Design an enzyme around this catalytic site. Structure first.
Site, short mmCIF file in Angstrom:
data_model
loop_
_atom_site.label_atom_id
_atom_site.label_comp_id
_atom_site.label_asym_id
_atom_site.label_seq_id
_atom_site.Cartn_x
_atom_site.Cartn_y
_atom_site.Cartn_z
N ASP A 137 17.29 -8.01 -5.98
CA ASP A 137 18.39 -7.22 -5.41
C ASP A 137 17.89 -6.00 -4.60
OD1 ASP A 137 19.64 -5.40 -8.41
OD2 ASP A 137 17.61 -5.67 -7.65
N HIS B 103 -6.79 -7.28 15.58
CA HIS B 103 -5.75 -6.43 14.98
C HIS B 103 -6.18 -4.97 14.71
CE1 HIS B 103 -1.91 -6.24 12.66
NE2 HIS B 103 -2.57 -5.33 11.92
N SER C 67 0.14 -1.38 12.38
CA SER C 67 0.41 -2.33 11.28
C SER C 67 1.71 -2.02 10.51
CB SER C 67 -0.82 -2.44 10.37
OG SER C 67 -2.00 -2.68 11.11
#
Lengths: 442, 442, 442, 442
Positions: B364, B417, B147
């Site tokens: 940013d 998963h 993951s």
């Protein structure tokens, strides 16, 4: 009435559920109660004729196994029989106690007069009421009992043994032949719990400092403890019950050690992770009946009030944590015993305080066993008996096995009390190997 | 500074822990943080020289494996490697976020300016600070990432690849090449979560009535919800997040079905068991960092935060629970994503409300990947990619695999998963078989 | 008429053959043709009642499996089923084209008007005509289709589905929903064949020189080629069609590499071994029908004017061998398509030139599928779909799987198109595991 | 002169090739020949020091194994040894004969004086020329010989034995001690070939009709019988050699039966498929040297005077096909012998007709074996001997085994002559178990 669901599937299994309506108390017409069970089979064998097997669950108030994949003992059982897990009355789908719609019992006397219907003898009469409807020609069936399931199984050999083909027991033989055996059980329990504590510190020597410093912090705290998120309080008496599963489980030592790494916040105060973990550690919120009935399963006549609380005073010189820290000794954990103060510390137990005392004062309980039938039994019985077991004492089991006519028994040091959950695959093969006659008598 | 513990044992394993002290910000000398890792080896193999392996656990703020028996992938890896398990900075034992001693951060601005140091680039600089001290001659090592561990691994191939011998990834390839990919990821996620809901109701047809009836009871209740035991609130929006793990995990469908049997208190109220189970279902109390950082891992510039909350308006005609019950449609559960209201409903998230906004406003963020290096990589890479995955979109993965020079991968529909924790034994054998050259290129 | 042979034996198997007389065309009385099949069972089970299974062979006009030991999928299938192996009409022992008496058909038009009866829908009508005679109570049966067997199976779900219990397909889902899909199939095919050539030269870097030198020698030779032992001609166009089996087969790359080692006789001339091996590489001598019908299986209506030949002009900038050697590029192999010039180069194809044109000119073929029935199918279907397949494009398969109501499928990268013949034991177990319900729907 | 290639890979194996330049005649300085061998190892053991093993191939003029996956005996051998596979001088990649630019031998006398350098004694001098360069310290090595490889191995015990650690032989002990043993070998051969034909017709009773009809059609046809596609001819003598591999192979009976199903085109003419299959059945096109040398391997001083052709006259009363059909007896197949007429019938053999006579007429062949050394051997030897073998007579083998000092051998009826290619996993374990001392002498 009897009603039945549609089949549904889980990896490598087929499942279905049945629901029954049954008397609250026999010898009268009403009230009614409802009881739930699930039939399990291997993928292809839905309509095929096979022997039926009953599972009896390992505690006074727990739900059945609720499987999510084919694994462990269930995978082995389902190739040969039909697993029929069954939620015992008063838990799971089988009519648990009400809440949010707040308790219908107006006073503690009403609740106390209700809870006495949930003893093991009614669970046998209930299992009979199932068999005669569920088994296609009302044939006999075989039963498997873990822990308290073995206590049920001996009442089943006592009353109406005609339904049984053969009986399998793991770690579940009760002591018998007295009005109340609880003093004898706990008197031995406190001696075995000392051993388990010594093996723990011998394996993890660094923990002795951690527990001693933690007990000092709790003892010096302003309330004699610290508040939990759920409004309970942590105290040194509460910390000594942390080992209840932690010293008896197959995985308890490793899980307990990792929790004690986490006590202090990073730079001094107790960590919120530790308080959250401690609050989550044991099941009295989900299964409150386990705290209520725990003394009563040893009674068949004259009772004893809070017997474990009487007994710990005999050993106070080693079990008092606030002596141990002054004497520089390691503190001891405890397990499978209940105390009056526990109903004040634990938030889930708060409303049951009065009803628990009315049960503790009750005399004239009905009998569970009759030795004059067990002494001339004809049903085949096989039992796994663990040697170093914390939950039931070996010496009491091995003398009680003298009274059963035909029991075959095997003693091992290889497993903890959880040993049907973990490594259960070989247990079922070994027990069936004795009953089926592939390992004949030495 | 570097310290090391005594060896200790678990069934069929040997374990030891190391602790390091590391800069908070690598641009500066101070403050400093402590980081923790545990070395694991097979029985009696303690002194023998062998290749090292690093495991990156890969929940976006979760703790390491904490093993209790030799089982699954660890039992395989210890036949060939000296395994290192790392608690990532800010979680587990590696300096978790402060509480109980009440929060040191004066305001949400101070806390926001602290959390920004916990990205994946610092986790790579930290992992190399270990390697050069722990490995005998500062040699290369191999990394395994599940993951978000795969997201870390591509930053490691981007920056300081000289320490890597070979790389193994499970379900963990990120999308790359844009200032913020979050809109595209959630746009794809809502297409797939619909399918998972269809497969659920197709397997358990009777549940459609249960969820509709429950949503009406919640919607008609005073204030549109009911109070949890811990002072949270249950609302139809809260009920839609119940599927977050329940649709994506390997056992999720079965677990979810057994929970919905226990909604109604027996003879009308919601049961205390269902409220207690729902309160226990997800880990935001133990892992608050996983709610805080979840959107930021997709940002390398202007963030445009609350992307999932924008995107569900595009699908509101099927995800609105009230429209669903009024139109007699089956109501849909939701996948792994976070919404602004969740900080109001969930009691554990209450104090983080203001800090979560500042992280959503920040615009940013430093970059994570270096495509002009990845397009001429020389380190061997092998990846497992699941086809019907809910948590990362196959289409974004399969185009991103174009930008890595030497990669090999296998597409499969066989696993969910979580497929390293269940059946992990064959995953490690299959991935090593590609890199080790026993299965040459077709 | 229906006739049946004596049982005979092969290591661990029992075999018998049946022969049937069947119309050349339905809705007319005559002429008749003979169709052939062989029943196979495990050693002890000649007379035991068991379910029947039908196998459909995977090349248009290819012969049945002809086993000589118990191995691969046949060994496993015989644990549960009585296997039937069918030779399709116009091939094997089921009435192949006459040659040795004389090219009997009077004119190319007569041959063309004969060949059109050999399409997939008549193969399903033959299978129906068998079942009702062979199966003991005219029960349903299960079908297994490799490659072109999957094209037959979807016509069987479209027409007369009541004979099917459940359906298994490997690598065989056709594209559907247009008059002629052939241009879309070949347009995708070249995008895969390019990548197969890249993976080949990446594995064997030294071969690029060998093929360039060999192409120059062929191009400079008199008439642009060299004569074969059987009187055909080898030319750089003929060299590009080595890839047909060589890039598709499970051992294709290795087989191809060992052939290119032996091009020159030792000390300059092309080797007699290489010419004899090249002459032996293709199967058009034994299976002429495979070259004749190859575009026709995609025409549900309209017509194809040599669609593969029309398409390669779009890619000729890279597939022209002379451009490749002039520009110093690696030359590319090609596969699984036929071009008009091939009937001039290959000796076995010489007589069929005229009939192949008439089949290319023909329009208004009968339709093969019935989408308004497939959209509400009730028969269980399981399919193996290979992700990197040179034969059929995954992106056409994955959309076509939307139109079938109840299909389950697994995508995998780990097998070439031959994966039922090679390592096929696990494929039958995985596909039956979905239909039989041991792996329930995720 | 010695040169070596790059490593390359095949599933579960690593391969590399070496090339050597070697004298044509060791009594001279020139001319020179090229010899080729390929070293094989298991994955990752490329640099590891291990014992070497040499494999010697089954028949005069056959090519080496050319593996395409880890399977059979090679998979097992690579568990312990670095395997070397040798292409013998005059075949495979080791300087084969040359066509295309016709034949350099302007005369049969030149070709005859050239071919005599390809006998088994020079193959041992090639193996010694390799070992001293290839083995890292010029240590001893172990040899494995199948069939004609066993004939080589006894010359390698006779001359230069100092390079041998231990010797393994399968089905390959030659008869020794006379100037030409060929008459004795072919005298015994017909006594076995008769019994193989009896077992064939006993297993497939219906075939007696098919072969009798087919012989009549050939015999009544114009000239010798029917032309082949490659310009050869099929005749009743040609049909009798069809069983050459068909009776001897481990799978031969079944493959022969399937081919005899296909003889007629459908409605009476000999089928195009059968002619093509027959033309393809045996390898005289690819391995012409196998026909030229076949009798000479038995000769020392005395002539190879067409002994098989001299011998069949003794048995012609049963082997004449025309007598067999006139007397209604089943016709017999033949194998492992060559006749003068075969150079007229088979198109591949046509140019060698003159040179084959000059070899057959030769006397003063140099010797191969040294019995006065073999009777005092000290190298360990183990041999597999097959009881019902068509190739080599058991009676000649078991008397020759008296002349070897230390030989251990095992006799079985479990395997046809090809056993090492099919049962190879257990054959190599059994033979190594004798040499290694795990099964000591009875």
């Amino acid at each position: 009435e009897h009603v039945t669901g549609k089949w549904f599937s889980v990896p490598e299994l087929r499942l279905r559920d049945h629901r029954f309506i049954v008397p609250l108390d026999y010898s009268k017409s009403s009230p009614k109660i409802t009881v739930f069970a699930r039939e399990i089979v291997a993928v292809g064998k839905e309509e095929q004729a096979m022997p039926y097997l009953l599972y009896l669950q390992g505690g006074p108030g727990f739900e059945g196994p609720r499987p999510s994949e084919a694994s462990g003992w269930i995978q082995r059982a389902c190739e040969e029989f039909r697993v029929v897990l069954l939620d015992q009355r008063g838990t799971g789908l089988s009519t648990p106690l009400i809440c949010s719609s707040m308790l219908q019992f107006k006073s503690a006397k009403e609740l106390a007069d209700y809870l006495v219907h949930f003893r093991a003898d009614n669970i046998v009469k209930d299992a009979e009421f199932i068999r005669v409807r569920l088994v296609p020609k009302a044939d006999p069936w075989t039963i498997l009992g873990q822990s308290f399931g073995g206590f049920c199984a001996l009442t089943y050999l006592s009353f109406a043994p005609e339904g049984l083909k053969q009986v399998l027991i793991t770690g579940g033989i009760p002591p018998i032949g007295k009005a109340c055996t609880a003093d004898d059980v706990y008197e031995a329990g406190f001696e075995q719990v000392a051993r388990q504590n010594e093996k723990y510190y011998k394996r993890f020597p660094q923990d002795i400092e951690i527990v001693r410093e933690l007990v000092n912090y709790l003892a010096e705290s302003e309330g004699g403890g610290v508040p939990l998120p759920s409004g309970g309080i942590l105290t040194p008496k509460g910390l000594q019950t942390l080992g209840l599963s932690g010293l008896g489980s197959s995985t308890g030592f490793e899980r307990l050690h990792y929790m004690l790494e986490r006590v202090w916040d990073p730079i001094k105060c107790i960590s919120q992770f530790f308080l959250n973990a401690f609050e989550s550690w044991h099941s009295f919120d989900a299964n409150p009946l386990y705290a209520l009935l725990h003394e009563a399963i040893y009674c068949e006549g004259a009772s004893s009030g809070w017997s474990a609380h009487r007994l710990r005073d005999k050993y106070e010189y080693k079990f008092d944590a606030m002596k141990a820290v002054k004497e520089s000794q390691p503190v001891l954990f405890t397990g499978e015993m209940i105390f009056p103060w526990m109903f004040d510390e634990i938030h889930a137990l708060k409303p049951f305080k009065a009803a628990a005392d009315l049960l503790a004062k009750k005399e004239d309980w009905p009998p569970l066993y009759d030795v004059p039938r067990l002494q001339n039994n004809k049903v085949p019985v096989a039992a796994a008996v663990y040697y170093e077991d914390m939950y039931v004492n070996f010496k009491l089991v091995t003398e009680t096995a003298s009274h059963i006519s035909g029991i075959r028994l095997w003693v091992t040091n290889e497993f903890m009390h959880s040993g049907l959950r973990d490594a259960g695959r070989q247990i079922i093969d070994h027990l069936l190997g004795m009953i089926n006659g592939k390992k004949p008598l030495f």
